[PDB]
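User: Quick sanity check before I run a bigger batch. Here is a single chain. Can you write out its predicted 3D structure?
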Amino acid sequence: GVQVETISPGDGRTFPKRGQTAVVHYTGMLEDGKKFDSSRDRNKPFKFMLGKQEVIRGWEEGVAQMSVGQRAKLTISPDYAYGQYDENLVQRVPKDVFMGVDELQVGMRFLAETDQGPVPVEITAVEDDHVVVDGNHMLAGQNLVFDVELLKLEA
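Assistant: Done. Predicted structure follows.
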Protein backbone atom coordinates (compact mmCIF):
# COMPACT_ATOMS: atom_id res chain seq x y z
CA GLY A 1 0.00 0.00 0.00
CA VAL A 2 1.01 3.60 0.68
CA GLN A 3 2.30 5.03 3.96
CA VAL A 4 2.32 8.76 4.73
CA GLU A 5 4.96 10.29 7.02
CA THR A 6 4.69 14.02 7.68
CA ILE A 7 7.70 16.18 6.86
CA SER A 8 6.00 19.51 7.60
CA PRO A 9 2.42 20.02 8.81
CA GLY A 10 -0.42 21.51 6.81
CA ASP A 11 -3.51 23.32 8.05
CA GLY A 12 -5.08 20.01 9.10
CA ARG A 13 -8.44 21.19 7.77
CA THR A 14 -8.66 21.29 3.95
CA PHE A 15 -8.21 17.88 2.31
CA PRO A 16 -8.52 16.84 -1.37
CA LYS A 17 -11.83 15.48 -2.65
CA ARG A 18 -12.88 13.88 -5.92
CA GLY A 19 -12.77 16.16 -8.94
CA GLN A 20 -10.63 18.82 -7.23
CA THR A 21 -7.31 19.98 -8.66
CA ALA A 22 -4.40 19.27 -6.34
CA VAL A 23 -1.33 21.47 -6.89
CA VAL A 24 1.91 19.93 -5.60
CA HIS A 25 5.67 20.07 -5.76
CA TYR A 26 7.17 16.59 -5.67
CA THR A 27 10.41 14.63 -5.90
CA GLY A 28 10.24 10.96 -6.90
CA MET A 29 12.93 8.52 -5.81
CA LEU A 30 13.64 4.82 -5.75
CA GLU A 31 13.76 2.94 -2.46
CA ASP A 32 17.49 3.64 -2.13
CA GLY A 33 16.85 7.37 -2.65
CA LYS A 34 17.96 7.78 -6.27
CA LYS A 35 15.93 10.56 -7.88
CA PHE A 36 14.01 9.85 -11.09
CA ASP A 37 11.57 12.79 -11.31
CA SER A 38 11.09 16.18 -9.66
CA SER A 39 8.72 19.04 -10.42
CA ARG A 40 11.06 21.30 -8.43
CA ASP A 41 13.76 20.69 -11.05
CA ARG A 42 11.37 22.24 -13.60
CA ASN A 43 10.37 25.14 -11.30
CA LYS A 44 6.76 24.29 -12.09
CA PRO A 45 4.18 22.88 -9.65
CA PHE A 46 2.46 19.70 -10.79
CA LYS A 47 -1.34 19.71 -11.11
CA PHE A 48 -3.70 16.74 -11.18
CA MET A 49 -7.36 16.02 -10.53
CA LEU A 50 -8.15 13.62 -7.69
CA GLY A 51 -9.95 10.50 -8.84
CA LYS A 52 -9.08 10.97 -12.53
CA GLN A 53 -6.36 8.29 -12.33
CA GLU A 54 -3.85 10.82 -13.67
CA VAL A 55 -1.45 9.61 -10.94
CA ILE A 56 -0.61 6.28 -9.32
CA ARG A 57 -2.85 4.79 -6.64
CA GLY A 58 -0.35 5.66 -3.91
CA TRP A 59 -0.82 9.32 -4.83
CA GLU A 60 -4.61 9.06 -5.11
CA GLU A 61 -4.90 7.66 -1.58
CA GLY A 62 -1.81 9.30 -0.08
CA VAL A 63 -2.37 12.89 -1.20
CA ALA A 64 -5.98 12.55 -0.05
CA GLN A 65 -4.66 12.16 3.52
CA MET A 66 -2.73 15.45 3.26
CA SER A 67 -4.04 18.89 4.19
CA VAL A 68 -3.13 22.09 2.36
CA GLY A 69 0.40 23.25 3.12
CA GLN A 70 1.53 19.79 4.20
CA ARG A 71 4.81 18.21 3.09
CA ALA A 72 4.91 14.44 3.43
CA LYS A 73 6.84 11.29 2.55
CA LEU A 74 4.82 8.80 0.48
CA THR A 75 6.18 5.24 0.68
CA ILE A 76 4.47 3.31 -2.12
CA SER A 77 4.50 -0.40 -2.97
CA PRO A 78 4.69 -1.58 -6.60
CA ASP A 79 1.01 -2.57 -6.65
CA TYR A 80 0.23 1.04 -5.69
CA ALA A 81 2.74 2.55 -8.14
CA TYR A 82 3.50 1.19 -11.62
CA GLY A 83 2.76 -2.46 -10.82
CA GLN A 84 4.78 -5.60 -10.30
CA TYR A 85 7.20 -6.75 -12.98
CA ASP A 86 5.25 -8.54 -15.72
CA GLU A 87 7.28 -11.42 -17.15
CA ASN A 88 4.82 -11.73 -20.05
CA LEU A 89 5.97 -8.33 -21.36
CA VAL A 90 9.52 -9.66 -21.85
CA GLN A 91 10.19 -11.77 -24.93
CA ARG A 92 13.06 -12.99 -27.10
CA VAL A 93 12.78 -11.93 -30.75
CA PRO A 94 14.99 -13.93 -33.16
CA LYS A 95 16.53 -10.72 -34.62
CA ASP A 96 15.06 -11.43 -38.06
CA VAL A 97 12.02 -9.32 -37.13
CA PHE A 98 14.21 -6.21 -36.91
CA MET A 99 15.16 -4.99 -40.40
CA GLY A 100 17.44 -1.99 -40.12
CA VAL A 101 20.66 -1.61 -42.10
CA ASP A 102 22.06 0.66 -39.33
CA GLU A 103 22.72 0.22 -35.64
CA LEU A 104 20.12 -1.53 -33.45
CA GLN A 105 21.04 -0.36 -29.96
CA VAL A 106 20.47 -1.87 -26.56
CA GLY A 107 18.42 0.59 -24.54
CA MET A 108 16.51 1.87 -27.57
CA ARG A 109 12.87 2.53 -26.69
CA PHE A 110 10.08 2.51 -29.27
CA LEU A 111 6.46 1.57 -29.91
CA ALA A 112 6.04 -2.09 -30.86
CA GLU A 113 3.01 -3.97 -32.18
CA THR A 114 1.76 -6.04 -29.25
CA ASP A 115 -1.39 -8.05 -28.64
CA GLN A 116 -2.40 -5.20 -26.29
CA GLY A 117 -1.78 -2.51 -28.93
CA PRO A 118 1.07 -0.18 -29.86
CA VAL A 119 2.98 0.35 -26.61
CA PRO A 120 6.52 1.34 -25.59
CA VAL A 121 9.13 -1.40 -25.35
CA GLU A 122 12.89 -1.44 -24.79
CA ILE A 123 15.70 -3.56 -26.18
CA THR A 124 17.42 -4.75 -23.01
CA ALA A 125 19.72 -7.38 -24.53
CA VAL A 126 20.97 -8.57 -27.92
CA GLU A 127 22.41 -12.06 -28.35
CA ASP A 128 23.85 -13.90 -31.34
CA ASP A 129 20.45 -15.21 -32.48
CA HIS A 130 17.99 -13.35 -30.23
CA VAL A 131 16.92 -9.87 -29.16
CA VAL A 132 15.32 -9.32 -25.75
CA VAL A 133 12.39 -6.88 -25.89
CA ASP A 134 10.96 -5.67 -22.57
CA GLY A 135 7.63 -3.86 -22.47
CA ASN A 136 7.56 -3.37 -18.71
CA HIS A 137 7.35 0.07 -17.18
CA MET A 138 10.82 1.29 -16.24
CA LEU A 139 9.65 1.41 -12.60
CA ALA A 140 7.75 -1.89 -12.63
CA GLY A 141 8.35 -3.88 -9.45
CA GLN A 142 9.99 -0.93 -7.68
CA ASN A 143 9.05 0.44 -4.28
CA LEU A 144 8.94 4.22 -4.63
CA VAL A 145 9.40 7.14 -2.23
CA PHE A 146 7.91 10.57 -2.93
CA ASP A 147 8.53 13.91 -1.26
CA VAL A 148 5.20 15.68 -1.85
CA GLU A 149 4.07 19.16 -0.78
CA LEU A 150 0.40 20.04 -1.24
CA LEU A 151 0.68 23.69 -2.25
CA LYS A 152 -2.94 24.32 -3.23
CA LEU A 153 -6.40 22.87 -3.64
CA GLU A 154 -8.48 24.32 -6.49
CA ALA A 155 -11.84 23.98 -8.20
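The chain has two domains: 1-87+136-155, 88-135.

User: Great, the batch can go ahead then.
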